[PDB]
Design a protein around this ligand. Structure first.
Ligand SMILES: *[C@@H]1O[C@H](CO)[C@@H](O[C@@H]2O[C@H](CO)[C@@H](O[C@@H]3O[C@H](CO)[C@@H](O)[C@H](O)[C@@H]3O)[C@H](O)[C@H]2NC(C)=O)[C@H](O)[C@H]1NC(C)=O
Ligand SMILES: *[C@@H]1O[C@H](CO)[C@@H](O[C@@H]2O[C@H](CO)[C@@H](O[C@@H]3O[C@H](CO)[C@@H](O)[C@H](O)[C@@H]3O)[C@H](O)[C@H]2NC(C)=O)[C@H](O)[C@H]1NC(C)=O
Ligand SMILES: [Cu+2]
Ligand SMILES: [Cu+2]
Ligand SMILES: [Cu+2]
Ligand code: NA
Length: 499
């Protein structure tokens, strides 16, 4: 069952064996992935998070981010540790009380402390639209049509060297899959469809690192949503999905009744499908209960290309139709050396006092904010452009902005910008050497918004900056509840920190 929009959510430690190998984890709702949190557009969500963690090897503090939800007027509820709050300590709870006006689509939630989400704290978050403009394109859209793609590690995250090329041990599809080494024939996930019906498959990357080449043997996929943004229909036979991205696609159950492989090939870790790695099963009602015998093509004739996507609504692009054609045009220098990432010459290391609390305590320019050099102010009611030229090791890097979605004016692997009708999204691959992926948005949401690579190992190694959007209006726009004001005193007392 789905939970929400008003619900408790307990965060616990438990052993799990999603690929046959037992290890302890950090779980929401007792499962991997966590339960789906759901509601309708404009609803009030109140997710009271109970931190019941006791195993220090995965951290006993926690904080949860609602990925892709704008949090307008509720910056304090966004979740990134030391940006919008101090962590919740064990044996305490915290009500994330916010609203979702003007958003409907496929999202997710995850820990936003250190690399803790890699240890298991990740689940789907779906905001349905009772008047969805795509409703007539499908028959079925429910918890059974969510497809999660996850990387899974046998080593605990706090034992992964900072700045290293860290590699997974299994791909999990809906929580199940097989290990790349010492492979055992552990259970595969099954997605069941009825011949003749059309399904809104909500594809969610909950990855900590790899991108996946996702396909379904014998089937194609008609994209209708990108990171929460309704799209024009785009039919593809393969989707390369980067960490934290989401797509809705229509699956037409129009092939013969049978069993078909579902494939998710990561860019690192195990290559291919030997022993049923990187796989799940699409089963038609009435099919024999047996593994598929289908094969992939040698090459995919209609892969997703990001410049082919266009919004369903007339969203346009803010600003003027040329590079630098914005009120505040930025170019970030994105680099890696010696195990650490940097942005504009500064490697991100979380501050002792969360950025939001520094601003509410009176610090009002970005040079007064800590970490020094890691906070850039943005002016209010302005068009912002951010060029993100690639080249830093460990690519392709999927960059994500909190508090906002953005027009993708220039995409990976294509030097031509689009000032007319590019897709809008919230996480974007910045591509390869010589690319100049560029995003635009308008500043109508006061507060500190994290910008970072969504390969969690890279964020841990410093690949982040904070956009302090409209510092002067942050306090009036974001009144804070007493329970939020209590978080840093409690956390600092528990950890013997002075501030
Ligand atoms: C990606 O696109 C951005 C624009 O969106 C390009 O930024 C431009 O970068 C050049 C230098 O590479 C800038 O010109 C330089 O300016 C300094 C003075 O600030 C001057 O001293 C240098 O001689 C040179 O003129 C230009 O200002 C800038 N545009 C903006 C908005 O900052 C960037 O080069 C592109 N990157 C790649 C890898 O294609
Ligand atoms: C590289 O990225 C550029 C920019 O996003 C892509 O260019 C766009 O290509 C589309 C599709 O062909 C062009 O739209 C076409 O416009 C014509 C004339 O209106 C229309 O009759 C066609 O039906 C279609 O709508 C679009 O104008 C063009 N934009 C720009 C700024 O050049 C390009 O396709 C991408 N390259 C690859 C290999 O995908
Ligand atoms: Cu995220
Ligand atoms: Cu986010
Ligand atoms: Cu990265
Ligand atoms: Na425009």
């Amino acid at each position: 069952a789905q939970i929400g929009p008003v619900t408790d959510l307990h965060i616990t430690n438990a052993n799990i064996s999603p690929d046959g190998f037992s290890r302890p984890a950090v779980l929401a709702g007792g499962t991997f992935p966590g339960p789906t949190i759901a509601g309708n557009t404009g609803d009030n969500f109140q997710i009271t998070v109970f931190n019941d963690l006791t195993d220090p090897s995965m951290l006993t503090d926690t904080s949860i981010h609602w990925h892709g939800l704008f949090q307008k007027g509720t910056n304090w509820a966004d979740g990134p540790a030391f940006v919008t709050q101090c962590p919740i300590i064990t044996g305490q709870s915290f009500d994330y009380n916010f609203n979702v006006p003007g958003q409907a689509g496929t999202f997710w939630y995850h820990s936003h402390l250190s690399t803790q989400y890699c240890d298991g704290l990740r689940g789907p978050f779906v905001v349905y639209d009772p008047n969805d403009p795509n409703a007539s394109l499908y028959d079925v859209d429910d918890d059974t049509t969510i497809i999660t793609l996850a990387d899974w590690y046998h080593t605990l995250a706090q034992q992964e060297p900072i700045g290293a090329a860290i590699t997974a041990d299994a791909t999990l599809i809906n929580g199940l899959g097989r290990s790349f080494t010492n492979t055992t024939a552990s259970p595969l996930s099954v997605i069941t469809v009825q011949s003749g019906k059309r399904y809104r498959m909500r594809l969610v990357s909950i990855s900590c690192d790899p991108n996946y080449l996702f396909s379904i043997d014998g089937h194609d996929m008609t994209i209708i949503e990108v990171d929460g943004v309704n799209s024009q229909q785009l039919t593809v036979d393969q989707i390369q999905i980067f960490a934290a991205q989401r797509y809705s696609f229509v699956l037409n159950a129009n092939q013969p009744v049978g069993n078909y492989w579902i494939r998710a090939q990561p860019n690192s870790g195990g290559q291919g499908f030997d022993g049923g790695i990187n796989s799940a099963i699409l089963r038609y009602e009435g099919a024999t209960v047996e593994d598929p015998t289908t094969t992939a093509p040698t090459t995919f004739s209609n892969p997703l290309v990001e410049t082919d996507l266009h919004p369903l609504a007339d969203l346009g692009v803010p600003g003027q139709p040329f590079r630098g054609g914005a009120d505040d045009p930025l170019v970030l220098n994105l680099a890696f050396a010696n195990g650490r990432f940097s942005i504009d010459g500064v490697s991100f290391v979380p501050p002792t006092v969360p950025v939001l609390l520094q601003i509410l305590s009176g610090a009002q320019n970005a040079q007064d904010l800590l970490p020094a050099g890691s906070v850039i102010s943005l002016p209010s009611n302005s068009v912002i452009e951010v060029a993100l030229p690639a080249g830093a090791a460990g690519g392709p890097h999927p960059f994500h902005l909190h508090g906002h979605n953005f027009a993708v004016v220039q995409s990976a692997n294509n030097a031509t910008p689009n000032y007319v009708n590019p897709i809008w999204r919230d996480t974007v691959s910045i591509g390869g050497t010589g690319d100049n992926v560029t995003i635009r948005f308008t500043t109508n949401n006061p507060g500190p918004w994290f910008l970072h690579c969504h390969i969690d190992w890279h964020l841990e190694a410093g690949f982040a900056i904070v956009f302090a959007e409209d510092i002067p209006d942050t306090a009036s726009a974001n009144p804070v509840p007493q329970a939020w004001s209590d978080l840093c005193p409690a956390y600092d007392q528990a950890h013997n920190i002075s501030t």
